[PDB]
Amino acid sequence: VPLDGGRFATSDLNDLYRRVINRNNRLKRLLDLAAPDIIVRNEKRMLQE
RNA sequence: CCGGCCGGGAACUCAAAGGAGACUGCCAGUGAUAAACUGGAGGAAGGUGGGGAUGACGUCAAGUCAUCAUGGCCCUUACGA
């Protein structure tokens, strides 16, 4: 929801699923790029977190 | 006396052919879930892989009567030989 003035009074539910997906799309990107193991796997670390 | 000179062999180089194959088959991004384009792996060859042949109705009364033939015109003691 918008805040009077020009800001946002949002419940972090969004700011976590956004994270679940920012990281998620970046992960699929990192695989089309075919980056080395431990790096894209460190990405799956961030996916499970 | 290694310009394979003499045996020997049938897989290959080469060649005459029956066929496989490459068709956007797969992943991803972009994008109106369509099509399409780019990159990469796969792959002998990749985005109709390259080239020739194939030239849609027509434009130009453009070429050939000098391959030849032809409705006709001229010559037939001739230009015919």
Side-chain angles (χ1 to χ4, degrees), chain A residues 12 14-15 17-18 23-24 38 42-43 45:
Chain A
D12 307 307
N14 287 304
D15 295 304
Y17 283 110
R18 172 184 63 60
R23 292 179 174 175
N24 185 58
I38 313 78
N42 189 61
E43 180 65 61
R45 181 85 62 66

Side-chain angles (χ1 to χ4, degrees), chain A residues 22-45:
Chain A
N22 181 302
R23 292 179 174 175
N24 185 58
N25 194 296
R26 179 177 299 180
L27 176 144
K28 296 186 287 184
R29 175 182 66 173
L30 293 177
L31 292 170
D32 298 316
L33 293 174
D37 305 301
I38 313 78
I39 303 178
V40 288
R41 293 189 170 176
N42 189 61
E43 180 65 61
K44 285 185 281 300
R45 181 85 62 66

Side-chain angles (χ1 to χ4, degrees), chain A residues 10-21:
Chain A
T10 175
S11 293
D12 307 307
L13 292 169
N14 287 304
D15 295 304
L16 284 177
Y17 283 110
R18 172 184 63 60
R19 187 177 296 183
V20 179
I21 304 176

